[PDB]
């Protein structure tokens, strides 16, 4: 199809090298973040998401880190092997600036499911690094009453992991710290380009990809749209189609649909 670099980027914070698929195309990049059952060695964005074909030759780099399954692409309080906020917001962009000549900031983050959450959280709390956040079937309001219980249940069922070790027990209130719904005001006032896609049905061809809780991603995305507008957000694109799978059958073509918007934002 098209050669790309299979980078092994050191993550001092996680204590191992992270596989990162990298297609050079310019100083600014789009970081692609996997669904919950993420490819350990190669991102599902490359294989099922058709990312390199869709985005090649458009004047931006493509960056797709692997190995982030059942992580919410965040820093875990009790898991040293899951420090994805530090890696994605600091170690990776610093490595690419030092070793592949990319700009420090003005990048895009785009993802599905946990990757949709991850993209929105990265831009909210690190606007210096990401001027664009795109979310497909994303859990954009994880601290929500029903959602936090749903994420905990699904992460244990499909991933065998305890989310108490991620952001503490949710009763302690720290899930709100990392929540882009709660901190939608950051996204609005920083003028981040936001792109949100979520069908108004809970269908998921691969249940593990949505940890069996696609209905919560559906509701989270709708509530994020209302919250974003209510805090003065005015640089967003929202699409809530009646039909469509919460899975790669829809996510792959949706990357093509938003590609022009990514390029307009970061190149």
mmCIF file with all atom_site columns, C-alpha atoms in Angstrom, residues 4-9 18-24 29-32 41-47 51-52 61-66 92 96:
data_model
loop_
_atom_site.group_PDB
_atom_site.id
_atom_site.type_symbol
_atom_site.label_atom_id
_atom_site.label_alt_id
_atom_site.label_comp_id
_atom_site.label_asym_id
_atom_site.label_entity_id
_atom_site.label_seq_id
_atom_site.pdbx_PDB_ins_code
_atom_site.Cartn_x
_atom_site.Cartn_y
_atom_site.Cartn_z
_atom_site.occupancy
_atom_site.B_iso_or_equiv
_atom_site.pdbx_formal_charge
_atom_site.auth_seq_id
_atom_site.auth_comp_id
_atom_site.auth_asym_id
_atom_site.auth_atom_id
_atom_site.pdbx_PDB_model_num
ATOM 1  C CA . UNK A 1 4  ? 5.501  3.933  6.930  1.00 0.00 ? 4  UNK A CA 1
ATOM 2  C CA . UNK A 1 5  ? 7.947  3.859  9.852  1.00 0.00 ? 5  UNK A CA 1
ATOM 3  C CA . UNK A 1 6  ? 7.383  1.358  12.641 1.00 0.00 ? 6  UNK A CA 1
ATOM 4  C CA . UNK A 1 7  ? 8.946  3.548  15.358 1.00 0.00 ? 7  UNK A CA 1
ATOM 5  C CA . UNK A 1 8  ? 9.840  2.282  18.821 1.00 0.00 ? 8  UNK A CA 1
ATOM 6  C CA . UNK A 1 9  ? 9.571  5.473  20.877 1.00 0.00 ? 9  UNK A CA 1
ATOM 7  C CA . UNK A 1 18 ? 5.896  2.158  22.530 1.00 0.00 ? 18 UNK A CA 1
ATOM 8  C CA . UNK A 1 19 ? 5.272  1.054  18.918 1.00 0.00 ? 19 UNK A CA 1
ATOM 9  C CA . UNK A 1 20 ? 4.224  4.114  16.873 1.00 0.00 ? 20 UNK A CA 1
ATOM 10 C CA . UNK A 1 21 ? 3.221  3.919  13.206 1.00 0.00 ? 21 UNK A CA 1
ATOM 11 C CA . UNK A 1 22 ? 4.539  7.127  11.617 1.00 0.00 ? 22 UNK A CA 1
ATOM 12 C CA . UNK A 1 23 ? 3.994  8.512  8.115  1.00 0.00 ? 23 UNK A CA 1
ATOM 13 C CA . UNK A 1 24 ? 5.899  11.756 7.599  1.00 0.00 ? 24 UNK A CA 1
ATOM 14 C CA . UNK A 1 29 ? 0.590  15.588 12.881 1.00 0.00 ? 29 UNK A CA 1
ATOM 15 C CA . UNK A 1 30 ? -2.689 13.875 13.682 1.00 0.00 ? 30 UNK A CA 1
ATOM 16 C CA . UNK A 1 31 ? -2.402 11.412 16.588 1.00 0.00 ? 31 UNK A CA 1
ATOM 17 C CA . UNK A 1 32 ? -4.803 8.480  16.073 1.00 0.00 ? 32 UNK A CA 1
ATOM 18 C CA . UNK A 1 41 ? 1.688  -4.066 18.259 1.00 0.00 ? 41 UNK A CA 1
ATOM 19 C CA . UNK A 1 42 ? -0.053 -2.167 15.434 1.00 0.00 ? 42 UNK A CA 1
ATOM 20 C CA . UNK A 1 43 ? -2.880 0.340  15.935 1.00 0.00 ? 43 UNK A CA 1
ATOM 21 C CA . UNK A 1 44 ? -6.271 -0.777 14.616 1.00 0.00 ? 44 UNK A CA 1
ATOM 22 C CA . UNK A 1 45 ? -6.378 2.623  12.878 1.00 0.00 ? 45 UNK A CA 1
ATOM 23 C CA . UNK A 1 46 ? -3.746 1.264  10.461 1.00 0.00 ? 46 UNK A CA 1
ATOM 24 C CA . UNK A 1 47 ? -5.364 -2.141 9.807  1.00 0.00 ? 47 UNK A CA 1
ATOM 25 C CA . UNK A 1 51 ? -5.641 5.503  8.115  1.00 0.00 ? 51 UNK A CA 1
ATOM 26 C CA . UNK A 1 52 ? -2.516 5.636  5.937  1.00 0.00 ? 52 UNK A CA 1
ATOM 27 C CA . UNK A 1 61 ? 2.028  13.585 9.473  1.00 0.00 ? 61 UNK A CA 1
ATOM 28 C CA . UNK A 1 62 ? 0.183  10.523 10.809 1.00 0.00 ? 62 UNK A CA 1
ATOM 29 C CA . UNK A 1 63 ? 1.038  9.138  14.256 1.00 0.00 ? 63 UNK A CA 1
ATOM 30 C CA . UNK A 1 64 ? -0.654 5.989  15.610 1.00 0.00 ? 64 UNK A CA 1
ATOM 31 C CA . UNK A 1 65 ? 0.636  4.595  18.933 1.00 0.00 ? 65 UNK A CA 1
ATOM 32 C CA . UNK A 1 66 ? -0.090 0.943  19.732 1.00 0.00 ? 66 UNK A CA 1
ATOM 33 C CA . UNK A 1 92 ? 5.930  11.473 22.148 1.00 0.00 ? 92 UNK A CA 1
ATOM 34 C CA . UNK A 1 96 ? 9.123  13.609 17.327 1.00 0.00 ? 96 UNK A CA 1
#
